[PDB]
């Protein structure tokens, strides 16, 4: 129970459905635990407070 210093491991995240017409098929994907993000290229918080 403590905050890690060295970097960890990731699935990693991947983008998928966005537009107003999909027609998906559900083929493949990862049975392994993964992560899927809706918006492309987010993670915006560049301010560092010393």
């Amino acid at each position: 129970d403590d905050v890690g210093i060295m970097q960890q491991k990731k699935p990693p995240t991947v983008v998928q459905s966005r537009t107003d017409v999909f027609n998906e098929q559900f083929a493949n994907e990862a049975l392994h635990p993964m992560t899927k993000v809706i918006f492309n290229g987010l993670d915006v918080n560049t301010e560092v407070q010393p």
Binding site: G4, M6, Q7, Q8
Partner: peptide, 27 residues
């Protein structure tokens, strides 16, 4: 140092055929 890793080990087993000795023990 940089990335946290993982290693593996297995307890080893060492044996030779019973050697011959020329020295006696008891009377």
């Amino acid at each position: 140092a940089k990335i946290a890793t993982a290693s593996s080990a297995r307890q080893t087993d060492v044996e030779k055929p019973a050697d011959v000795t020329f020295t006696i023990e008891n009377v």
